[PDB]
């Protein structure tokens, strides 16, 4: 059964609610982004209206084979009427196609649902600048002050400089990057660009990337592994055993692997600056864990909420324990008292 924080009151709408069968009273199902915890349940057999971005719609059609007649893509930054209710989709600064949704309820209430997001000051000059938001359904993934990490730009600078140094010292080194979902494409694209290579990958991953509206993508990716010195593999294979096995398959073209695992936050963020990060090494294989986040840091989240000044906050992540719920509620009260709303 569908939980309360996935229902939008007085609209007939649910958000990211495809794993509960037919939800009583739901006339339209919104999907914020194409990550499996959120799309869980969609297939070629779904026959209710789905509202989403153009990119999410491309993935629904081609990867999950949802029929075209049920996919309703909406442009960003544009007032749209859906089943008698005004809505707006805004970029969430998460993975490709990820949106936040603004709902203008018939009674005058205004709700913002962030989906998954990485809060940024640029959001303070979207269509949010205008009007009051009464209720905020908030991505609280990293809602605790211990969660610090660098900007995406600083992490990409580190990865580019590391890869370029290694391959210039050894032109027979292979670079490998882990993936298990869409998002974080800049990691492998930036490294391939500095090295003058296309990114090599499976047919299945190539298909997924072709759905994303990335400019000049045919120039950047390929299924021909032999032509490429940046390879993508499943995240599960980014370990000494799996990389040893991959190196065997490359027919003596390479004699070294440099690999990257883009994680979220890890406990080594409490001790180590991005500049100081070192790999794990065994023989001719080195593995770097890099803290590339597509979710708000604690400080980014706090700044956005203190700017927005919502009347009520409904968390959508870490909702399953009393300890987590009490911790989040204490932070929301601190933020409100400090800022005066
Ligand atoms: C006192 N009620 C609370 C629930 N409520 C509502 O509208 N629920 C809902 C159901 C299904 C859906 F899709 C969306 C919302 C508002 C009035
Ligand atoms: Ni996500």
UniProtKB/Swiss-Prot annotation:
Entry comment describing in which tissues the protein is expressed: Expressed in brain, heart, kidney, liver, pancreas, placenta and skeletal muscle.
Compartment(s): Nucleus
Quaternary state and interactors: Binds constitutively to TP53BP1. Binds CDC27, which is itself a component of the anaphase promoting complex (APC). Binds PIAS1.
Signal sequence region: none
Disulphide bonds in the chain: none
Protein name: DNA cross-link repair 1A protein
Species of origin: Homo sapiens
Family: Belongs to the DNA repair metallo-beta-lactamase (DRMBL) family.
Phenotype when changing residue 139 to N: Impaired nuclear focus formation, reduced interaction with PIAS and increased sensitivity to cisplatin
Encoding gene, per UniProt annotation: DCLRE1A
Highest rank taxon of the organism: Eukaryota
Stated role: May be required for DNA interstrand cross-link repair. Also required for checkpoint mediated cell cycle arrest in early prophase in response to mitotic spindle poisons. Possesses beta-lactamase activity, catalyzing the hydrolysis of penicillin G and nitrocefin. Exhibits no activity towards other beta-lactam antibiotic classes including cephalosporins (cefotaxime) and carbapenems (imipenem).
Induction: During mitosis. The mRNA encoding this protein contains an internal ribosome entry site (IRES) in its 5'-UTR. This 5'-UTR generally suppresses translation while specifically promoting expression during mitosis, when cap-dependent translation may be impaired.
